[PDB]
Amino acid sequence: EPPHLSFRSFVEALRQDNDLVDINEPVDPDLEAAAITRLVCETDDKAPLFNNVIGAKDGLWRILGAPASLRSSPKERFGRLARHLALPPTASAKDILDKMLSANSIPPIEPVIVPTGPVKENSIEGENIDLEALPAPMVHQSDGGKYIQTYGMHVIQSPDGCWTNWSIARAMVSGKRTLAGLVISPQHIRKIQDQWRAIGQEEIPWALAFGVPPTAIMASSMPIPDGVSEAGYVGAIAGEPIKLVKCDTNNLYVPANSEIVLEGTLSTTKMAPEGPFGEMHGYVYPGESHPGPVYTVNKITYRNNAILPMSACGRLTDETQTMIGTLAAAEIRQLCQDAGLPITDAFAPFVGQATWVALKVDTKRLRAMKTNGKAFAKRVGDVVFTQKPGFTIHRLILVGDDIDVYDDKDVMWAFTTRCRPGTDEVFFDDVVGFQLIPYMSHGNAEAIKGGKVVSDALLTAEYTTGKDWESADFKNSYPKSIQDKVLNSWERLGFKK
Amino acid sequence: PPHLSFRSFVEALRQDNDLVDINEPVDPDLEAAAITRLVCETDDKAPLFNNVIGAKDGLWRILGAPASLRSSPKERFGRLARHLALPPTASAKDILDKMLSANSIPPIEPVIVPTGPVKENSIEGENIDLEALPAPMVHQSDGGKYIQTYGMHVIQSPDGCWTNWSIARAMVSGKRTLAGLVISPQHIRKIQDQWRAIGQEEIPWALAFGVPPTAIMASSMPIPDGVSEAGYVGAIAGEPIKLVKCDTNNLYVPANSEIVLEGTLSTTKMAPEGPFGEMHGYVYPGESHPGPVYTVNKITYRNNAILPMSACGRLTDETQTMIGTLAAAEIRQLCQDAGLPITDAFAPFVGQATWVALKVDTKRLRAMKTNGKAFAKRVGDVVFTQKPGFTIHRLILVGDDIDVYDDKDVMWAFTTRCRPGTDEVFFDDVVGFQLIPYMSHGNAEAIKGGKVVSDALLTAEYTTGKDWESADFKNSYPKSIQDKVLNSWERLGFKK
Ligand SMILES: Cc1cc2c3c(c1C)C(C)(C)CC=[N+]3c1c([nH]c(=O)[nH]c1=O)N2C[C@H](O)[C@H](O)[C@H](O)COP(=O)(O)O
Ligand SMILES: Cc1cc2c3c(c1C)C(C)(C)CC=[N+]3c1c([nH]c(=O)[nH]c1=O)N2C[C@H](O)[C@H](O)[C@H](O)COP(=O)(O)O
Ligand SMILES: [K+]
Ligand SMILES: [K+]
Numbered sequence A: 001e002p003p004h005l006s007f008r009s010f011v012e013a014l015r016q017d018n019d020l021v022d023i024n025e026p027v028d029p030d031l032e033a034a035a036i037t038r039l040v041c042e043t044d045d046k047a048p049l050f051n052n053v054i055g056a057k058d059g060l061w062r063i064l065g066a067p068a069s070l071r072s073s074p075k076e077r078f079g080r081l082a083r084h085l086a087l088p089p090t091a092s093a094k095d096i097l098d099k100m101l102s103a104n105s106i107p108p109i110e111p112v113i114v115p116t117g118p119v120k121e122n123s124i125e126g127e128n129i130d131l132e133a134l135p136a137p138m139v140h141q142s143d144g145g146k147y148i149q150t151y152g153m154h155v156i157q158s159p160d161g162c163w164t165n166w167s168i169a170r171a172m173v174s175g176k177r178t179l180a181g182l183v184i185s186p187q188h189i190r191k192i193q194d195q196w197r198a199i200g201q202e203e204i205p206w207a208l209a210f211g212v213p214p215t216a217i218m219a220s221s222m223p224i225p226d227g228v229s230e231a232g233y234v235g236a237i238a239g240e241p242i243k244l245v246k247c248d249t250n251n252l253y254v255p256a257n258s259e260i261v262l263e264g265t266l267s268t269t270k271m272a273p274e275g276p277f278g279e280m281h282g283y284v285y286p287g288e289s290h291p292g293p294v295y296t297v298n299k300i301t302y303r304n305n306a307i308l309p310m311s312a313c314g315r316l317t318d319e320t321q322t323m324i325g326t327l328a329a330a331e332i333r334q335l336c337q338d339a340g341l342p343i344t345d346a347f348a349p350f351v352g353q354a355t356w357v358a359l360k361v362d363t364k365r366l367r368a369m370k371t372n373g374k375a376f377a378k379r380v381g382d383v384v385f386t387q388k389p390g391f392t393i394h395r396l397i398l399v400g401d402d403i404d405v406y407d408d409k410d411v412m413w414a415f416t417t418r419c420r421p422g423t424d425e426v427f428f429d430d431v432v433g434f435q436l437i438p439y440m441s442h443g444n445a446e447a448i449k450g451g452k453v454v455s456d457a458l459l460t461a462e463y464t465t466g467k468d469w470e471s472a473d474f475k476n477s478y479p480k481s482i483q484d485k486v487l488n489s490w491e492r493l494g495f496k497k
Numbered sequence B: 001p002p003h004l005s006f007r008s009f010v011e012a013l014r015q016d017n018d019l020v021d022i023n024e025p026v027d028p029d030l031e032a033a034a035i036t037r038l039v040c041e042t043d044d045k046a047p048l049f050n051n052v053i054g055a056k057d058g059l060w061r062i063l064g065a066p067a068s069l070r071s072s073p074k075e076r077f078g079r080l081a082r083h084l085a086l087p088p089t090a091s092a093k094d095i096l097d098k099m100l101s102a103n104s105i106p107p108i109e110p111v112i113v114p115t116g117p118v119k120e121n122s123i124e125g126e127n128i129d130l131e132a133l134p135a136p137m138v139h140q141s142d143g144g145k146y147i148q149t150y151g152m153h154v155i156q157s158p159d160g161c162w163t164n165w166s167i168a169r170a171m172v173s174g175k176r177t178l179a180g181l182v183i184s185p186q187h188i189r190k191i192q193d194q195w196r197a198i199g200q201e202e203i204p205w206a207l208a209f210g211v212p213p214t215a216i217m218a219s220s221m222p223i224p225d226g227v228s229e230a231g232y233v234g235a236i237a238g239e240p241i242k243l244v245k246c247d248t249n250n251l252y253v254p255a256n257s258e259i260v261l262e263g264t265l266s267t268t269k270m271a272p273e274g275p276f277g278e279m280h281g282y283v284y285p286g287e288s289h290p291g292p293v294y295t296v297n298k299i300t301y302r303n304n305a306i307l308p309m310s311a312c313g314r315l316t317d318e319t320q321t322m323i324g325t326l327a328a329a330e331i332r333q334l335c336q337d338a339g340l341p342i343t344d345a346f347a348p349f350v351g352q353a354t355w356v357a358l359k360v361d362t363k364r365l366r367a368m369k370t371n372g373k374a375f376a377k378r379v380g381d382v383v384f385t386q387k388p389g390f391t392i393h394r395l396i397l398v399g400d401d402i403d404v405y406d407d408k409d410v411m412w413a414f415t416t417r418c419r420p421g422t423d424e425v426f427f428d429d430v431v432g433f434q435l436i437p438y439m440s441h442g443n444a445e446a447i448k449g450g451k452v453v454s455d456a457l458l459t460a461e462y463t464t465g466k467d468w469e470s471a472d473f474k475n476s477y478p479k480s481i482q483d484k485v486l487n488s489w490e491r492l493g494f495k496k
C-alpha cells in the first residue's frame, strides 16, 4: 500500500526522503523521547524514529516523533505533510489544503471490509493489560500523566449506527486499564458522547487506532461537517476505499493496517483528573487538572514491530500548528465561499500560534459588491464565528489579492499597515470562544465566550476604485528591465546567490 | 575612527567583509536604488557605487544600505554597531543602551576647528546646478530625485541656543532648490515655526551628508525638545565632535562630512514634494503635497565624496533599524521617567516600525496592586501624548519571560496573552502618524487616533505571579535531559 494509505509505508517514504533518523540507542519514554522530538520541532529537523524505547516488551512499542512537522529546506517545507496525502514533497500549503477540501464536492468512497490485517498480528486482553507498564511517553515534565494519545484516531459511532466519527483528542494513562481525555464542545466526540448519555448508555463502544493511514489522521484533524463519516471523506481524498477490519470485542471498524488499536468504552458518567498538558499555544499549567471522561481498555491489538506516533506539541512548530490551524483555515475558506464571500485563499499563519486565519479577498469581486470594510468584516465574522470550523480561531485578517496569505511576512505587513487598530476591527463578544487559549481560561473575561475579532486589512480604496499604491520593494518599485539587469549582475558584483 | 568619521566607517565595513566595491558604471536613475533595495530585502553587504553615471567634478559616489542588517545571526546588527564603536556581535539592547547612555550624563560640547576634509572642494551660487548632479531616483514612482535620504539637517532656533540635527527627506526641486517633508511634531518643523512667528523669511540652514556615524544615529532619535544633538552625540562617543563653520552662514557642520549644502529654509516658499517610497513599504503614484523650499547657495565636499542613500520600503532598511528602534529607546526612557515598571523596549520588524513591545518588571508591577485595563490606559496616556510616541500606533505590554528584542517571542505573547478587544485600550483622540496607509488612506481622520495598547500580561502576572511553564525544549525538560540530548544530537544524525 502507498504511503498515504499505510503508516508503515509512510515511515519508509520518510526514510527515502532523507527525512527520518532511525535512533537505535536506548531512549527513555520518560521525557527523553519527547525532548528530542521537541528540539526537532523547534529546528525543523528530520523526524525521529525511536526503535529502542526503554521498557518496550513484545513489540510494544517504537515511537515516531514529529510525524507532520516542517522540514528545514524551503522548497520542501511541507514535505512531511505532503507524504500524508500522495502529494510531492515540494507541495505548497495551498496544494495540501486544496487536497483536504477536494472530498467536499464529490461523492464519498465508502470503506471496504477485510477479514484481517497486520493490526491483528498480536493481542493483549483484559487483566493482562497494564497501561502503566507500557512505555507511554512523558511528553512535558509538568504534564498530569503519560500522554499515550497525541496522534491516534478515536473511532466512535452514533447510537443510530449511521455516523462513525474519526478524530484526534488527547488522552493520558489514568490507571491499569484506563485513560482520561479531553472531550469538549463542540467537537464531534463530545456530540456523540452526549447522544449516548441522552439514551442512558453508561459505557459507549470505542476504539483508538494509532499509526492509521496518513490520509485518515489528516481528516481526523479537520472539522468536516456534523454527521459526515470521515472514512468516506478519506476514501474520496485518497481516490480508493480505506480497508477496515472489525474490532475483536465490539462492532466498530478500524484501519486493517493500523500499528496499534485499543478497544473498549468511553464513559458517559465517570470522570478522572485529566491534564495538565503542554498544549498547542505553548503553555503547561503545573497542577491544573480538569475532569475528563474515562476510557476503559479491554483489548489491544498490534502489528509486529508496532510504532506509536507522538506529537510533542508546544511552541512552534508541531502538528498542532501544521494541522489544527491550517485545516481549520481550509474549512473556513469553504464556509466563506459557500456564503458567497469573494475569499480565494485562507491560511493560519504560524506567527498567530494557530489562533489567526488570514483570508485573501478577490478585490475585483469585492468592488462588484459595493460594500465597505465595516459591513464586510461584520459579515465574515457572522459567517465564520457561528460555525464549528471557526471555534479555535480568534482573529480573522482580511487582506487583498497582492498579499500571499501563505507567507507570515506578507500577512504581518498587511495587518500592521492596512488595519487601523479599533476603527477597522469588529469585535465579537457573544460567540463561542476557545478556552485553551491562556487569555481565555487564565484571562479577564468568560473562558468559553467572546474574545474574537475580524481585522479589515484592506485599504479603503480596495472596496471602491481599486489599488492606488505601489509596493516600495524590488518587485514593484523598479522596471522589469532594471530588475533583470540587477539579477544578471548580482553574483558577478559579489552579492550572495 | 569609524564612529567619528563616515570615510573610516566605510573602511570598517570593508574590513568586516560587509561592503561590495562596485567599480562597473551604475545609473543613479533607479539602478543604484534597485541594487540597494535587493541588498535590504536579503540582508547582504552594503553596496559602494564607486562609478556613478553622470558623476561631475568629484560628485559623487553612493553608499547604499548604510544601517541595514547583515544575514549572519551572530552579527545581524554589526552595521549599526560600527556606527557606535560597538563590536559587530552587539545585541539590539547594546545599541539602544548606548544611544540612551547620553540621557543621564553631561553633554560633551563640540569643539570648533578652522578647516577640514569637507572644505577640500566647493561649488558656489550660479555654478550650482542640482538637476545636473547624479541625485538618485530611489523608487520608479517617486515625485523627483531624493538626494536627501541619510543626511543631517542643521537648523538653529531664533534664541541661538538650540541647534537641531535631524533626518528629514528632501528631493531636488530646481537648479538651486530642494523640496522637503517638514511635519509636526518634528523639531525641524518646531524651529521653522519659531522663525515664521518672528517674521524671518529665510532661515539659515545646512545639510551634511556622510556625517560621523554617531551623529546620524542621534539625528534619527527623538531626544528632548531644546536639547542640541551635538552635545548628546559627544556624550555617546565619549569625546567632542569636531565642527567647522559653514562658509556662507553661522551654522557648524562636522569637519569630516562628505558633502555639505549651505543655504536657507523658507518660511513662505512651497513646492510640490513627493511622493516617496516610505518606511511602511508604500508609494502613492502622482500624490505630491506642498513642502517647504530649501535654497542652496554653496556646496563644499571631500575629494572622492560619497553620498549615503537609504532605499527605504519593505523590510529591512534604515527606517526600521533606526526610526522605530530609536523611538522605542526614547519610549523606554519616558516610561522610566513616569515611574512605570518598563525595563526594555523594542520595535519588532514584523510591526513595520508601527509597534513597540515594552518589557514589564512583573515583581515591581505586583507591588503596584493594579490590573491590565488600568495599566494599559496609563502607559498609553504617558507615551501617546509625547513626541517619541508619534510614529508608534501599537504598544504591546509583555512580562519579563518575553525577549522583546525577538519578534517570535513578541508575537507568541501578543497572540496568546492579549484577548482581542477585551485586553486592549484604544486611543481615538491622540496625534496619529498620517504616513501609515490606514491613516492617510483609511476610514477615519489622517492625523488623529488609530492607536492601541495591547495588554499581553496574563491576569495572574498583576497579582500572584507567573503560574505556567513554556512547552518548549528549554522550560519543559530537566537540565539533565537537555544535556543528554544536546551531547547526543549530532552523533544521532540531527543537524548542528
Ligand atoms: C492534530 C491534532 C489535533 C488535535 C489535538 C492534537 C493534535 C496533534 C493533540 C492531541 C497533540 C493536542 C490535542 N488535540 C486535540 C484536538 N481537539 C480536541 O478536541 N482535543 C484535543 O485534545 N485536536 C483537534 C481535533 O482533532 C480537530 O478539532 C478535529 O476537527 C476534531 O474532529 P471532529 O471535527 O470530527 O470533531
Ligand atoms: C533614519 C531615517 C529617519 C527618518 C527618515 C528617513 C530615514 C532614513 C528617510 C529619509 C529614509 C525617510 C524620511 N525620514 C523622515 C524622518 N522624519 C521626518 O520628520 N521626515 C522624514 O522624511 N525620519 C525620522 C527622524 O529622523 C526622527 O523622527 C528624528 O527623531 C527627528 O529628529 P528630531 O527629533 O530632532 O525632530
Ligand atoms: K474530524
Ligand atoms: K482597513
Ligand SMILES: [K+]
Residues within 6 Å of the ligand: B165, B166, B167, B218, B219, B220, B221, B222, B223, B229
Ligand atoms: K534628532
Ligand SMILES: [K+]
Residues within 6 Å of the ligand: A439, B372, B417, B418, B419, B423, B455, B456, B457, B458, B459
Ligand atoms: K492580558
Ligand SMILES: [Mn+2]
Residues within 6 Å of the ligand: A165, A166, A167, A188, A223, A224, A225, A226, A228, A230
Ligand atoms: Mn467529524
Ligand SMILES: [Mn+2]
Residues within 6 Å of the ligand: B164, B165, B166, B187, B222, B223, B224, B227, B229
Ligand atoms: Mn531634536
